[model samples]
Target: FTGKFEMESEKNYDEFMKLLGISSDVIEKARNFKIVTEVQQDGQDFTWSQHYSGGHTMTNKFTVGKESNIQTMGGKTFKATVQMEGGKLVVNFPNYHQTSEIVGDKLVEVSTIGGVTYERVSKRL
Candidate 1:
C-alpha cells in the first residue's frame, strides 16, 4: 500500500505535534517511527542515544545513526539514518524517512521515518 501525506510548516515539536493532534502517549513512546540502532562502519557505532517524553507514557529509547538497521513497531526491518541540520535532527530511510526538520534540542522532529513521506513546508518540520 502506497500513500502520500502532506506536512505543515513547523519549526519545533510543539507545532508539529499540534498538527498531528498527538497526545502524550503517542508522542513520548512513538519517537517518530523507525529508530536508528547501530551504524558500525568497521566495527564502530556512530550515533546518538536519546529519550523523548511527550504524549506517551514513558520516554522510549531511540538511536540516531548513519545507514543503520532499524526495528519498527510492526516488526519490520529497514536501514535508516538520523541526521542533523542547522537546528533539527532528521531520520532518513530508503523510502520512509522524515522530510521535515523541526527545531529541537535533542528530540527527533515529528516527521516520518523508515516508511513515510511528505511535502515541504515552513520551518522544515
Candidate 2:
C-alpha cells in the first residue's frame, strides 16, 4: 500500500478550479500538469509527497486521526485533520475537501469544492 504512482487521468478539473475561485491563467497552466505521488506508510503513520510539473513538489507527514499542517498545491498552508473515512484518506481544507482511496490497480482521488467534484486517477509506476 506504500508505493509510487503517476497521474493517469482526470475529470472535471477545470470545473473544480472554477468552484475554488482559481485564476484563469493558473488553471490553464495546471490544466495539463502532470503529478507523481510517492507514499510511505508505517503502521498508522504516513508520508505523502506529490511531485508536480516544473520541478514543484510538496510533502506532508501525519498520523491517522491527527491534525497536521499541509501545504496545498495552490500554495496555501493550513491545518487539517488527516483521517481515514470509510477506508479512504480524507482531508478537509479551508476551501475544499479531498479523499484518496486505493482502487484496483490505481489510486483514486476526488476533490470537491462548492459541490463540484474533480476526480484524478493514478496508476502505479
Candidate 3:
C-alpha cells in the first residue's frame, strides 16, 4: 500500500471509542469524519501516517519485525514490534494488535481490543 486511502466504512469503531470514555461530541464528529491513511511500503521498511479530523495525525516508520516506539493520537507513547508477514502489516498496539492488508484494491485494517473488534476499510485513491 503506497498511495493515500480514504475511509470506506467502519465497524465497531464507535463502540471502541466509547470504551475509552471519549466525549460523545468528539465521537460523533469522528464517526462522520472520513479517515485518511497514507503509507509507503518500500521493501521491508514502512512509513505510515493516519490523518484524522481536527488536525489529529499519527506518524510512524519502522522496518519489518522491528520494535519501534510509537505515539498514539490520544497521547499514549509505547513500543511494539511491527511485522510484515504473509503480505500483511501487523502492529502490536498495547493490549491489542492491528492487521492491515490490501484486499482487492482496498486497505482492510482490523484491530482487536479484547472483545471489541474494530475494522476500518479504506478505498484506494
Candidate 4:
C-alpha cells in the first residue's frame, strides 16, 4: 500500500495555492512541474513526500494519531497530526485541512481552505 504515484489530475489546487499566499510566480512554476508522490509506511508511522521536478519538495513524517512537526512547501514547520479515520489520513495545516485516501488504487487528496476545496488525484507510477 506504500508506493509511488504521479499526479494525474487536480482541480482548484492552483487557485488554492494562490490563496495560501504563495507568490504567483512560484505558483506558475510549480504548475508546470510534473508532480510525484512517495509514501513510506510502517505500521501507524508514515512518511509522505510530494515533489515536482526542480521544485521544493515537501515531506512530512508522522505516526497516526500522533502530533508531529509537518514540513510546509515554504520550508517552515507546522504542528499537525495524521489521523487515520475511515481509512483516510487527515491533517490540519496552518492554513488548510487536508485529507488523503486511496480510492480504487489511486490516491485522492482533498485540501480545504477558506470555503474552497482542492482535489488532487494520483495514479500509480
Candidate 5:
C-alpha cells in the first residue's frame, strides 16, 4: 500500500536535496520530480540515505511511530553513527548522499536544523 502527504517545505528543492546528500544530477532529477511514495506495512518505519557523485542529505520518516533526522547512503543504507535522543534524532550530513530514520510506535527525541522535536505516538494507518 501507499499514502500521499506533503512536507511543509522548510527548504526549497535545492535545500531539501542538499540535506538529503544528493548529487547535482539527483537533485536536478528530484527537482523535476514530485514527492510520491509507496508505503509498505502498517507500522514499519525505517531511515534512508542517498549517495551519488555530489554530497549527502538526511531525513526522517515514520510509520506508526515518530522518527527524526535519519540518514541514507545511496538511497538504501543505514548509518550507525547517528540516532535519536530525548525525542529527537541527530545526524551530521553533507558528506554522504542522503540519510533517513523512521520511528514506529516508539517515543524518541529528535534534533534537526529546524529544531528539536518529538513523536508522541506511532501512526495508526
Candidate 6:
C-alpha cells in the first residue's frame, strides 16, 4: 500500500484522452510518457507523488475522508475528496472519478470520464 510503482501498460488510454478534449499534439507527447508513482501512507494520511517524463511531477498530500487540492496534467487545479473504499483509494473529482487499488501484485487505476473508462496498470518497483 506504500510503495513505488512504475507504469507497465495502459488500456484504452487514447480514447480516454479524446474524451477529455485533449489535443492531438498534447496526446502524442503524453503517449510515450513514463509514469512512476510513490506513495507514503500513515494511518489515514497519505502522500502520493507521481513522477512523469519530461521532468514533470505531481504530488498530493491528503488525509482519508478529506478534501485536498489536486492538479491535472494540464496544470488545472481543483479540490477533490480523497477516500478509501473497499481497500482502494478513491478520488472524487468534479468531472471524473479515479480509483487506485492493487490487484494481483500490480497497482491498477481506473478512471472514468463521462461514460468512458480507462485503465492503467503499474508494477511495484
lDDT of 1 by residue, 37-111 (tens): 221122223322221223222112334444666453334565666555654446665445463233331222345
TM-score of 2: 0.90
Whole-model lDDT values for every prediction: 0.39, 0.88, 0.84, 0.85, 0.38, 0.88
In order of appearance, the predictions have TM-scores of 0.32, 0.90, 0.88, 0.89, 0.31, 0.92
TM-score: model 3 vs. ground truth: 0.88
Instruction: Quote the lDDT for 60 in model 1.
Output: 20
lDDT of 2 at 36: 95
lDDT of 6 at 12: 90
Worst 10 residues of 5 by lDDT: 116-125
In model 5, which regions exceed 4 Å deviation? Answer: 1-5, 15-26, 36-78, 92-125
User: Residue by residue across 49-119, what tens digits does model 3's lDDT show?
Assistant: 98987778899888888788877667778788878789888878658888989998899999888899999
Candidate 1 has an lDDT of 0.39
lDDT of 5 by residue, 14-121 (tens): 654566567988767655433322234333454332222344444545432333344343445443344444434345544432223344532222224343232212
Instruction: Rank the models by TM-score, top first.
Output: 6, 2, 4, 3, 1, 5
Better of 1 and 5 by lDDT: 1
Clashes of 3: 0
**Candidate 4 lDDT, tens digit per residue, 18-42?**
8878888888877877878999999
* Candidate 6 local lDDT, 23-51, one digit each (tens): 98988988998999898999999888899
Model 5 — TM-score against the truth? 0.31
Candidate 1's C-alpha runs over 4 A off are 1-65, 99-108, 112-125
Q: What residue pairs clash in candidate 6, if any at all? A: none
Model 4 is weakest, by summed lDDT over 10 consecutive residues, at 69-78
